[PDB]
């Protein structure tokens with residue numbers, strides 16, 4: 111499944127495909143942009159299939175509902191919703207277009223890479239563990255991006271040697287998605303990614 115959106119400030123593409131032979135995806139995403147701001151999130155539920163879905167889907171619902179809050183507030187709501195559930199790894203990104211500012215908070219193995227034209231990348235290491243409902247000491251990143259920046263957020267189902275290169279070479283989110291096609295054919299796990307190109 112592919113979903114594309116565009117406004118004056120960003121173009122985005124969401125890709126998701128289930129693990130081969132699996133009916134119920136354990137990954138979830140949420141994406142909304144208006145003329146002023148973006149929120150997006152990607153999550154991978156612990157366990158698999160349905161119960162994994164309950165955890166990642168709870169994340170998607172809370173990010174939509176609480177989108178106006180700061181990323182760390184949103185992720186803590188997500189953490190509290192994981193008590194008595196499988197848990198999930200998750201990443202939450204907000205962008206203010208006028209300021210060209212992003213804010214990012216994550217726990218687990220959902221990765222975020224933002225490539226700058228100038229050749230700077232923001233590519234944080236994964237935070238160990240997962241959102242379980244037990245206490246967390248979150249790290250929030252706040253930074254300015256430059257016009258032309260391109261990013262991806264992806265679950266562990268996408269395994270790529272050099273993601274930065276795909277972001278650098280692509281001229282659009284469709285092109286970057288197509289550039290990644292070889293990594294999508296095996297379907298060894300659920301695979302979700304969100305691409306963005308920022309004006």
Ligand SMILES: [Mn+2]
Nearest residue numbers: 154266267299
């Ligand atoms: Mn996974």
